[PDB]
Symmetry: C3
Subunit: 81 residues, 3 copies
Amino acid sequence: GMKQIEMKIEEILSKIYHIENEIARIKKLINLKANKADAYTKDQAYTKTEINSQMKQIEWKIEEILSKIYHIENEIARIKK
Amino acid sequence: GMKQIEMKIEEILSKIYHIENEIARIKKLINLKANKADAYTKDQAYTKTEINSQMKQIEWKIEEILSKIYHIENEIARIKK
Amino acid sequence: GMKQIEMKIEEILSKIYHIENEIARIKKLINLKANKADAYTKDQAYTKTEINSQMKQIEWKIEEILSKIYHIENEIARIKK
């Protein structure tokens, strides 16, 4: 009777020790994780694709401008010839 | 006396099983969390507000340029007439 | 004999109560962590440095353009004098 209880107690203590070691490992893993309060999401930041689209709009306007200037410089060269 | 100890042991074993199931769930949840080593924060990235401020300044410069170019093209047109 | 078993059961119940409190804490910590499904990383977003480089490239072009426009305006003022 006592022997059976003692055996169950030994198994219980082993399970508890194992749990305590799992919890220690979990605490270490948690500390490797980023906080919600810090990490940027779609609510805070643009994606690469979103930035690329905005930059592309600018770049087309730059190229159009350069093209207009090149034409202007040729016009001036014709006037002064 | 032995009956009461056995009952407590049953309760302990149930509690342990419950705890083990919670830990298993916890481990799976942790694995769905982003790592500090990967997640971008204010130290790594601009916000949408920061980007928007920079893009609006560029657009203002572009708007200034386009006014100057239109003016020039009209000046040239007058010289050639 | 039965007294000593009762004391080991008391120590086990104390350990379990402590563990339950650790688990409750762990769950609270996990809920403060950002999800992989939400957090932006290098796979979703540019860094400040990467944006700065792109913005510097645009700024150079704007500078080139402003210089060309200033030159052209001076050339036109001379032609019309």
